[PDB]
Amino acid sequence: AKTIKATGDGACLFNAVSIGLSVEILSGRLDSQLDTPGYQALLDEFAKHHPQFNPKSWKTLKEWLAYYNDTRDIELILAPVLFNLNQKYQDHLDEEILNELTNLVWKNKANIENGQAWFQLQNTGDLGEALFPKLENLDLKKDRAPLLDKLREILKDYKLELTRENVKQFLTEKAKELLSALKKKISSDPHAFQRGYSCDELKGMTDALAISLVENREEDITDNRIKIRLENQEEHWNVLCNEEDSERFLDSTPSRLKMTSLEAYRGDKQVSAP
Secondary structure: OEEEEOOOOOOHHHHHHHHHHHHHHHOOOOHHHOOOHHHHHHHHHHHHHOOOOOOOOHHHHHHHHHHOOOHHHHHHHHHHHHHHHHHOOOOOHHHHHHHHHHHHHHHHHHHHHOOOOHHHOOOEOOOOOEOOHHHHOOOHHHHHHHHHHHHHHHHOOOOOOOOHHHHHHHHHHHOHHHHHHHHHHHHHOHHHHOOOOOOHHHHHHHHHOOEEEEEOOOOOOOOOOEEEEEEEEOOEEEEEEOHHHHHHHOOOOOOOOOOOHHHHHHOOOOOOOO
16 A cells, blocks of 8 residues: 655656556566567567667566666656557547548638638537647647648648548548658657646557556456556656565665656667666
């Protein structure tokens, strides 16, 4: 019944998950899963992020977690890796962005063609629902203005009557490279990495890792998977870890790393191999 404070700066949910996951890994309780596709993908992402990680094996990954065992070091070495792995498990994000871009163009085709600014566009539907929230959270100058310019170019080839279905099919066929670029920004841009995430936004990844995230003591007694128990606060998530596990598998080494969550994510400042 020990509350472990996770760091606020960066991807706060990912910091707490990294601490909880490290306990399950180092205790051996996930050993049966380490050869499954989810843990092979985690290993691949750990190696891609850490150039001094070698050889590429779960032995080396456990060695890194045991050497860099202060919880603040664990966040720095593992939270960026989990953030990158999560992006591989967003099977419905392409459809979501296509639907956002479809709503934008369908409700604002003439506005866009006429050179109107982002604030002048209809962004709310007939039920008061947000029509393109992920697009409107992109950077106004660097992303949203170039998006409107790009849509003006693309719409020159629009040769159908204006209906939502026609817009969606047109964008599916003719805006593939734009849609791919928007997915990268929404997945990994500055705002993407420090906005604040729900646990449901990590479900694809945690499902692949055979883990259930339990938020605020709301437990599924029919779920027999390994559980990481979390508490949600402001500028902080907490991980719950039993006292025996925390004494053995966390904070067993002095803190060794001295970089910010953002420098760790960008990844240029390499972590030294043990």
